[PDB]
Amino acid sequence: NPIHDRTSDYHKYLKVKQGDSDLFKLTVSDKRYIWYNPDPKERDSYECGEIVSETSDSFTFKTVDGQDRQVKKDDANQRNPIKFDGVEDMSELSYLNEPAVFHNLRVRYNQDLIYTYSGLFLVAVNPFKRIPIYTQEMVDIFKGRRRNEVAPHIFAISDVAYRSMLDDRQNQSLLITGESGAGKTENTKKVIQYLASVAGRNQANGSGVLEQQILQANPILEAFGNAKTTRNNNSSRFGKFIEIQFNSAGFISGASIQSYLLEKSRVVFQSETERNYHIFYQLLAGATAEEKKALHLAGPESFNYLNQSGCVDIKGVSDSEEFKITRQAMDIVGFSQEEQMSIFKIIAGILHLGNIKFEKGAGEGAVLKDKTALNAASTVFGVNPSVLEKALMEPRILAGRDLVAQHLNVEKSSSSRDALVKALYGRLFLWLVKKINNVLCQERKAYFIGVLDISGFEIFKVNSFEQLCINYTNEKLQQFFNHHMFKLEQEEYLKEKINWTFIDFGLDSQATIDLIDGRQPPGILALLDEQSVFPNATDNTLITKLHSHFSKKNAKYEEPRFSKTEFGVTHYAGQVMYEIQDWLEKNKDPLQQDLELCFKDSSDNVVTKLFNDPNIASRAKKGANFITVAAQYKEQLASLMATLETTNPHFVRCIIPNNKQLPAKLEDKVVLDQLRCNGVLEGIRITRKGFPNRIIYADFVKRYYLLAPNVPRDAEDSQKATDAVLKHLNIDPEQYRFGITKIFFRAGQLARIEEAREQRISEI
Amino acid sequence: TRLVPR
């Protein structure tokens, strides 16, 4: 039984070295330490100092050098007794503060234990090297085991989700976070491989190519949906939910992908040093001479949509080699060579559209002097250039019953062209997903286990509308986690008959969510929509209105002291300041019907599907004319949340250890920022308000019997013995609660009992 | 433990 055999790879790579005699009697004294910040500006960089003095409301310790400081006991981050080093769940720590959480992750990472639970979360730190814990032999160990029967592992989360799906006949979701480099793509692959292995029905037919197809969808979706931003070279700018589907007997039957919230604005504008979506650079770098000739291609410097940010390449990334991978993936998921060329023609056409330069003609009317870009776009799109030219500068509308051409000026023509580009790109993205699903989903499912990953909580020096949307999505998903943790905690306290009550943790997020999307009183999105109706509004009247409705009236909002154009929102991950510039423009999403009429007549098979398929195209309207971008956003998010609320969720948090791609180098500043952005610290905050440590009575007595007079180590009535120890030590009863089978302790109290044990043993 | 000379 490898789970008990200290010589197995299960023990070598998934358990703490302790074994039995090793980590258990390695001395210990009576000295206590504290975690502190050597430089107050870097709040996530710590060192360990020795406590020296001790007073009423403060401690006194010597910095790692010898200098001295003091800290209000109310703010001190004490270090846990050595017995707590390496625990498999952060909830087992007694001092539950940020540096202590990092320390435990580090004790484990330094022994190559990359998986650690933190309450409901499975935290997975990229080791930046291969560890042999994904073999068939490891799969067999996890098969059918409960989370508390085995060490932390992505296979444990996967198995529990699979058994719950079968036992409860309920779909499951696995919400996984992590920026590129965190190991999220690899962990998601392990989930899929694990499910294919335990739910495989491979005898006779083999396992086919479904797994391979699901994995190959990645390079395609990343090429069109990921981009370099100032904080990550490969940032996902969309959300995706990959359903691994099963038949009624529990065997894998197929998969499906659904995308959400793609950032279409990036196609037409990118901030300094960022890039447009990777596919544009891949195509220009890897197309063959003949493909460049037929698509009228040139270098990225030659296109307005790729030459404004100052950055066209990524250090260490070959866009040409990445294009090769993208095409190979397209072959595997079934795109014909002709469909692939049509996809590239549309990407080329978007670039040519971006190069059209509208000029003021004789009067205000826009005109096109040089028809080069127009003609190149028309050729690759398979449309009539005269029709496209008129649809761009003289789109017709109905004035009463009369068809009238609105002759646009330069600004409106440029804007319409951009709107056409964003529509083409978004529809193309939906068509790619639909085409991939043509091969992934060929049987009606009975159930599914879906993996969700979306853009992570984002903070830049200057944050705009796109960032508020991304962060609002993250806020809603964190409330979803909080609510589920609440339901699970309610059941644990009730099962133990613990005398402590609490309300739905999801309510802690309501103030921020209401600030953003409330309707009554109206939140930010509602006031942005209100300000998008009349021409009297400006970005300045918009922020004045936000300050008027929320400054000093909503605790989660801040009118900054020294900026007239930013407003602050306190999210679970901290405060984010948002710049209002251009929000009114960004909320408008109209597309001229004459442009759709133009493209509906394309001679290209894929272009016609983007404009004739009522699903990919159109949507509806609003009994009016068009839904704002904020209303579209809110609706896609609501659709995603409704899907999640039908499932039983599981949460995985993948972490980058450092930003140098170096193994064995866990950095606190880098790790703590991610734990803050991914909700782990929010889970810890909640955990600290209750009773995190829960100890079976007999185990408490076995360890602490010596701290009280005449209490047998193996006392027959473990509850009375536990009470005798607590009463003799004069523990404040508010710091613990007796349960039917375990004693519950508030943060810090068990560490103090452990410290008393260490002291008593050294005395003896 | 300190009661026992090492």
Partner: protein
């Protein structure tokens, strides 16, 4: 080294309030005997004063860690009576009775909580012994019915430990093969390597019989041997215990018995004290080296 027993005396004091832990194993001597063996008389003759509770049946209802320390002066102290010096041994007996009743609900049951009594006296050698409840069948007392098992279970907690030397006390005027002390010592120490035998009441044996074969270590062999004693109680003018006369009477007994004269120098209370002091000291010397590290791991 005159320092080993005192060192373990401190450890016993420190563990006196630490409840049972099967892994904690200090080098010490546990006194085991059937209720009829006269084990109280053996201890009172070491001290030279009557100081143990008197009553029918059980005399020790809580383990008594009795630390004897040779001294020029004579007085006693209980660990639970900080700073008090007892000089009247009748008060010592009364305090053992009071402290015992204080803990035991029923006035006849037992408790594992020890009473830690140290006696300084010119009549004793440096020696420590843990007296335990004597064994008996018929619960004849007043609660509980399973008393025999409760006593045996408490005795086993002590003597199943490897560092516990067993002082097995048996009366000569009985069937020594059926000795409760020697039988329980054989259950836990089959090779008879950590059991010291004491044969009491030698002067009470039937006319024409003697315990020579057991005293010579031939009939029921024990590596650490057997020592015979007799309680020939002498009272002084006031009617109180006269140890010098009692020890002289015991000496006269062994010198004049034709079956024991040749062993007299290895019989009697003074010799028994000498033997226990020597064997306990050597045992501590043996076990001390690995002690500190072991304790850390067992606490």
């Amino acid at each position: 080294m005159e320092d080993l027993i005192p060192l373990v005396n401190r450890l016993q004091d420190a563990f006196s309030a630490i409840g049972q832990n099967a892994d904690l194993d200090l080098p010490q001597i546990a006194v085991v005997g059937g209720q009829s063996a006269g084990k109280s008389s053996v201890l009172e003759n070491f001290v030279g004063r009557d100081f143990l509770p008197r009553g029918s049946g059980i005399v020790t209802r809580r383990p008594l860690v009795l630390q004897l320390v040779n001294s020029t002066t004579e007085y006693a102290e209980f660990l639970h009576c900080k700073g008090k010096k007892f000089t009247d041994f009748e008060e010592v007996r009364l305090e053992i009775e009071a402290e015992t009743d204080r803990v035991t609900g029923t006035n006849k049951g037992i408790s594992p909580v020890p009473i830690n009594l140290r006696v300084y006296s010119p009549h004793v050698l440096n020696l420590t012994l843990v007296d335990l409840p004597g064994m008996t069948k018929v619960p004849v007392g007043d609660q509980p019915p399973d008393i025999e098992f409760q006593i045996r279970d408490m005795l086993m907690q002590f003597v199943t430990k490897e560092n516990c030397l067993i002082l097995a006390v048996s009366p000569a005027n009985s069937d020594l093969a059926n000795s409760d002390a020697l039988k329980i010592a054989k259950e836990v120490d089959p090779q008879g390597q950590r059991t010291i035998g004491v044969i009491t009441k030698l002067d009470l044996m039937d006319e024409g019989t003697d315990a020579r074969d057991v005293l010579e270590n031939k009939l029921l062999p024990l590596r650490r041997g057997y020592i015979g004693v007799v309680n020939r109680s002498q009272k002084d003018i006031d009617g109180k215990k006269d140890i010098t006369a009692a020890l002289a009477a015991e000496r006269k007994f062994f010198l004049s018995h034709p079956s024991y004269r040749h062993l007299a120098d290895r019989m009697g209370t003074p010799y028994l004290q000498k033997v226990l002091n020597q064997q306990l000291t050597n045992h501590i010397r043996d076990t001390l080296p690995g002690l500190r590290n072991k304790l850390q791991s067992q606490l």
